[PDB]
Amino acid sequence: VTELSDAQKKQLKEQQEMQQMYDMIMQHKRAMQDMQLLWEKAVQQGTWEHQLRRMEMDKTREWAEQLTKMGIGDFLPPDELEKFMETFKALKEGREPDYSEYKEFKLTVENIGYQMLMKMGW
Amino acid sequence: ELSDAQKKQLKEQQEMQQMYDMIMQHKRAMQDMQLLWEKAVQTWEHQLRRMEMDKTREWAEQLTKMHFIGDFLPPDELEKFMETFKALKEGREPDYSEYKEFKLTVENIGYQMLMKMGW
Structure with missing residues (x-):
């Protein structure tokens, strides 16, 4: 984004930073859910639980x-x-x-992570 | 006389601000207990821990x-x-x-339910 005022650069960096904080929290939530299902299916079958643990x-x-x-x-x-x-x-x-x-x-x-998002909003 | 859509905005905004307030007040109450407990550490420290x-x-x-x-x-x-x-x-x-x-x-x-309201 070119030719912004200082005012504009400040609003935009805040927006993008809040948005990235948000996206990263959802990414981390996504990946944790994926690890969860991987374990739910491995138990539907010891060394696996320790492998999943280390990945997590x-x-x-x-x-x-x-x-x-x-x-x-x-x-x-x-x-x-x-x-x-x-x-x-x-x-x-x-x-x-x-x-x-x-x-x-x-x-x-x-x-x-949540406290940081909360300081960016509010 | 607010429209239906405007009442919904107003109600959502209040529930969010009410959720934000309760989180902030709980956080501050935890900060007070932490500060008092630290000074009990230079029992009473255990009693401050139990109230926390x-x-x-x-x-x-x-x-x-x-359920929820x-x-x-x-x-x-x-x-x-x-x-x-x-x-x-x-x-x-x-x-x-x-x-x-x-x-x-x-x-x-608590942070997640605030997050649901806000995003």
């Missing part, structure tokens, strides 16, 4: 990477931040965190 | 008043969610990692 963990790490580039200490109190970053680190290094902390990290990532 | 769980439990009852929660969780996640919810209702104290995940799940459900 990598998609969650990706979505967290996307969120970082969209913006977070602003969202977490000190103790939660250290744990969040630790788990993020293990996922990045390809290690497998404790399942309960992975679940906590995943919910936290989705939680921050 | 109660405020989460109240928030979850509030959202439910608006199994819309957000696959049936496995649904079961754990209701066990923790029922533990809280009955005055039991769950595993703290069981509570944290219920807290975050409750919150993400």
